[PDB]
Ligand binder design. Structure first.
Ligand SMILES: NC(=O)c1ccc[n+]([C@@H]2O[C@H](COP(=O)(O)O)[C@@H](O)[C@H]2O)c1
Ligand SMILES: NC(=O)c1ccc[n+]([C@@H]2O[C@H](COP(=O)(O)O)[C@@H](O)[C@H]2O)c1
Ligand code: BEF
Ligand code: BEF
Ligand SMILES: [Mg+2]
Ligand SMILES: [Mg+2]
Ligand SMILES: [Mg+2]
Ligand SMILES: [Mg+2]
Lengths: 464, 464
């Protein structure tokens, strides 16, 4: 990896465009006005890409040669990058201040700020915009995952009276549905801020290396079938497949995809009659988890539950909702996103089925069908010093007040009512709102403040 | 990177679920029934992740330790992975056959197949489903980018009579808007199959390393301002910023973002009056490219063109469409996706403006706002050998015929009319349809057939 080649091309040309005698460029990231966002993922970027000796003679030469062809011209700031190599042993003279990871902050607040610590390196602040702005992704995954946790918590509490099992109710199925291995690890880690169930194994190593947990692993899975392991037996032998699988995994939970040919026949006849003896004998710690995977998600879940309710001994819990026996559960992992998850739990509640009975899997909805524009994430210069004079700067496009940016040096504060406010124009310096909540997390090539994954999870808890 | 940790967790458990006495599992990828897809990106995955010694004693131990905690149980196929290590020096006994990269194939056709070449490794075929299915991403980017190229070609031809400059009409702005550095390189390389202009520098090294071009670089950029380089001058000094910037880049094309405060004022008064003398003196090879970046994209483009056409001499080309002088062009890089791109070129055509006048930048629309479901990309087992007998297998869920998969051994053929057909059930063996278009690209740890990026671009060309 070469940081000289990890920016938007145009930024290679910007050192020639700032006002002469500019000594400081100061910029900030916000999720510009999903009312609150989980701040998560900057620490991964600081450690993997920004800290330590990130400039060498070889990387400068590599970049020089690439840009000469890419621009068909010499624009590359060879001298400026060489200055960093010679003066600072290739450590970036940058200071980044940030809200603690895991913090849940309303939209429109400063989340981190970036500025150069050497006047010669005024151009460096925005060089690294591109790489820092990618923090949008773990923020957005963590935020959207937490929003689904809120929905699940509301309905689980209402239909059952407690939150038991909540952290296992939304399982990450998105490894194949993301755009890369690196994205899989980042997104899966962001989901694990809120939940514990994951099939996206890449998330584990990332958390272990960059954040750390008291537990050996931050997430867990269970054995589960896929269509190849059912259909390989042949269409006439779906029962033999089911029997073999539950018997191989007789003492741990096992998920078995049941819709290869006819989900309703599988539930009613195969599970509900032919193999019923192998289900009712299972432990509470080792249920069969039936997995439909096609059809209208709500309609399918309701009909599956109706079928099972007729074949197995249903109880009524203390809230008056129906509950399958403890050895039998359902997981819906097709077509799941925040919208359909809401539709399913509401439809279940309306038909008097406890949310205890169900869990969800989600792949693309969880890790891929998200963009930087969902929380309007963006990074802008708000302050410059030119000719020794500090100036508060901003953009304010006539036709889109939504793209208006903040002015001057920024700080994040608690209000007297304990909400958040971002103070502009250096007004934090007046101290009418107590101390700035941002902390220096990176300075001159070093990570200066860090959070464990356990701390992040605590910061990210729901109010309930 | 450890390929034992690069699968969906449940696949770790599948070796215990297939029918006993299974010696072969054979699987295929399709973009299940955007009528045609550009096949691109597999060669990256083969080289980066699948080839050579990918199993070691250490990687086996690491996976074993991780999975023991992840599953709270010892389900991991240590023996099976050890067998590959000892027998094949850690090289995967897998054969993959694929349509050539760059090929443009209608939906619902086999694009590649995967099978194990050693009966002991029947479980391996689908172990690597997760990593191979990520090919959805470069396929989908390449395909969506090419569809935008078709729109641009149609309107450019209609309004100008030719396709000159077509390959520079859609510029990749997506580096900050994708989910990771790795995704940035993959996505950017896929866009470069169709176009030559990019700010996502990461795409260049990926192409150079995995594909190769005769040209020094596969993509190019031009100097361009951003809001920090304009706003840093202070609000009252926008004209000074513009002047400094066009003067710094007087002999190459230069893009200058013009909407920091009031795009219409900037066009009519700053460029069109105060600095007009610095614009009309510019070369045809070094135009000013004015960049709006806010507002309704269609309304804004049209109003900018109207303003400019009143301040600069406009000609009428041989097709009857209005053309700005050659030293002046516009780039619209906000809110651009395939739908808004079509709306803008159509709106322009209606107001009699040549598409020669305009180019586009697109970030999230081009590289992030895409999912595996756009082309319905899926990987399924279609054939297995159990007890020495081959059986054709498939899923066919009752409530969604769209998830029905193909049966048996597959092959891809030209039809007598020159179209494509996927033959099922090993019917390609009858040779009634000319030769199979799938070629072995990977076998037993070796990449056996490779394509240059130049060949891919040729394969992916538009008809016209
Ligand atoms: N453990 C599992 O059951 C498991 C794991 C990974 C993916 N999947 C598949 O993921 C699909 C959902 O993916 P999307 O949410 O990306 O559409 C489901 O159809 C499911 O079959 C299932
Ligand atoms: N060379 C350039 O002009 C350039 C490069 C990269 C990103 N951008 C910015 O990208 C934004 C578009 O990004 P999205 O398409 O992801 O929304 C534009 O508003 C533009 O300012 C511009
Ligand atoms: F494994 Be099935 F095709 F979702
Ligand atoms: F650089 Be601008 F804020 F698009
Ligand atoms: Mg599925
Ligand atoms: Mg912009
Ligand atoms: Mg934007
Ligand atoms: Mg699917």
């Amino acid at each position: 990896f070469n940081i000289l080649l990890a920016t938007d091309s145009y930024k290679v040309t910007h050192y020639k465009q700032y006002p002469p005698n500019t000594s400081k460029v100061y910029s900030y990231f916000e999720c510009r006005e999903y009312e609150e966002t989980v701040f998560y993922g900057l620490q991964y970027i600081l450690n993997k890409y920004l800290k330590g000796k990130v400039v060498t003679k070889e990387k400068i030469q590599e970049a020089k040669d690439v840009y000469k062809e890419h621009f068909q011209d010499d624009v590359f700031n060879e001298k400026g990058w060489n200055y960093i190599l010679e003066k600072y042993d290739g450590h970036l003279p940058i200071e980044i201040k940030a809200v603690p990871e895991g913090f849940v902050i309303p939209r429109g607040n400063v989340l981190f700020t970036v500025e150069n610590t050497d006047p010669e390196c005024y151009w460096l602040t925005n060089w690294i915009e591109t790489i820092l702005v990618q923090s949008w992704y773990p923020i957005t995954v963590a935020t959207n995952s937490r929003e689904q946790k809120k929905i699940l918590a509301k309905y689980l509490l209402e239909t059952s009276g407690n939150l038991d099992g909540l952290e296992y109710k939304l399982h990450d199925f998105g490894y194949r549905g993301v755009s890369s291995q690196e994205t899989a690890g980042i997104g899966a880690s962001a989901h694990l801020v809120n939940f514990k169930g994951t099939d996206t194994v890449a998330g584990l190593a990332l958390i272990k290396k960059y954040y750390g947990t008291k537990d050996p692993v931050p997430g867990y899975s269970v054995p589960a079938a896929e269509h190849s392991t059912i259909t390989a037996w042949g269409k006439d032998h779906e029962k033999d497949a089911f029997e073999h699988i539950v018997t191989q995994f007789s003492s741990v939970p096992v998920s078995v995809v049941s819709d290869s040919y006819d989900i309703y026949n599988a539930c009613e006849k195969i599970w509900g009659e032919d193999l019923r003896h192998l289900i009712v004998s299972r432990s509470t710690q080792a249920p069969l988890i039936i997995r439909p995977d096609s059809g209208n998600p709500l309609d399918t879940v309701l009909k599956v539950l109706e079928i099972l309710g007729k074949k197995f001994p249903v109880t009524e819990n203390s809230k008056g909702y129906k509950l399958l026996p403890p050895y039998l559960r359902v997981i819906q992992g097709d077509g799941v996103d925040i919208n359909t998850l809401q539709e399913i739990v509401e439809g279940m509640k309306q038909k008097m089925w406890s949310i205890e009975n169900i869990a969800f899997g989600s792949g693309g909805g969880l890790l891929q069908k998200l963009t930087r524009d969902l929380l309007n994430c963006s990074f802008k210069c708000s302050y410059v010093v030119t000719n020794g004079l500090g100036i508060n700067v901003f953009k304010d496009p006539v036709a889109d007040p939504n793209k208006r940016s903040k002015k001057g040096r920024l700080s994040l504060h608690r209000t007297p009512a304990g909400n958040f406010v971002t103070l502009e124009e250096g007004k934090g310096d007046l101290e009418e709102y107590g101390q700035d909540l941002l902390h220096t997390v990176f300075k001159n090539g070093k990570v200066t403040k860090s959070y464990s994954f356990d701390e992040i999870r605590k910061n990210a808890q729901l109010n309930i």
